[PDB]
Amino acid sequence: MAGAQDFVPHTADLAELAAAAGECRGCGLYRDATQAVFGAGGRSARIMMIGEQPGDKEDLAGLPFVGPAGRLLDRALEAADIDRDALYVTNAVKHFKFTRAAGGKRRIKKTPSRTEVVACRPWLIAEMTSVEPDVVVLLGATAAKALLGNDFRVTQHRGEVLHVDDVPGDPALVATVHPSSLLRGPKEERESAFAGLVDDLRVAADVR
Ligand code: SF4
């Protein structure tokens, strides 16, 4: 078998899937991470949101989007009039890939290789088959490329509703900036970028 496929059980039950992901060895990232971080939410969710990976806070909370980027995402969701409890939120890879620097105040995320993304993608497929979302919001380059192709450029398709043929259930896809990118930079640029994230979330939420 390839990647995580043999570790994925034949079930759409999210609790069963999350327990199975705790035992995944589909790539190397399970070794140094604290635990797998599966998606959070229920199968009635109409909107699925996919980030890159659990970060330092998520790796220990056991839940996605709990750190500063998650708090910015909550502020954007509220501004977009979307209830976070109604979404299903997850990440392209389920184990935190990291390093430390001497004197650092946190573990530093490292970018998943395309190999790791493809290895973990069976979990993402299981999640999408389980949830059957009407729309998938892809937060950042890694997540967007996971579904849209390794050459895809988030920066070139902002605001656009995409549909690709190899995605199960043919949901609408909206690729946007990852909330972590909005945490730093000059104020005017951060404020414009925040408005653009709210716009993209509203596009996704307006999908019938
Ligand atoms: S990152 Fe994904 S494929 Fe790799 S070990 Fe973790 S759950 Fe399995």
Residue numbers in the entry: 1 to 208
Tell me, in the authors' exact words, what the paper reports.
Structurally, UdgX is highly similar to family-4 UDGs (F4-UDGs). However, UdgX is unique in possessing a flexible R-loop (105KRRIH109). Our earlier studies allowed us to propose a reaction mechanism of UdgX, which involves the formation of a covalent bond between H109 of UdgX with the C1′ position of the target deoxyribose sugar concurrently with the uracil excision from this site in DNA.
Substitutions of His109 in MsmUdgX with Ser, Gly, Ala, Gln, Cys and Lys showed the loss of its covalent complex formation with DNA but gained canonical UDG activities. In the reactions of the mutant proteins with ssU9, the entire substrate was converted to product by the H109G mutant, while hardly any substrate was utilized by the H109K mutant. However, H109 substitutions by Gln or Lys, showed poor activity. Further, the overlay of all the structures of UdgX H109 mutants showed that the overall structures are very well conserved with a Cα RMSD of ca 0.2 Å. As anticipated, we note a clear difference in the sizes of the active site cavities in the various mutants. When we arranged the mutants in the order of increasing cavity sizes (left), we noted that the canonical UDG activity of the mutants increased with their increasing cavity sizes to begin with and then with a further increase in the cavity size, the UDG activity declined (right). It suggested that the initial increase in UDG activity (H109K to H109Q to H109G) occurred because of the efficiency with which the water molecule could be localized to make a nucleophilic attack on the C1′ position.
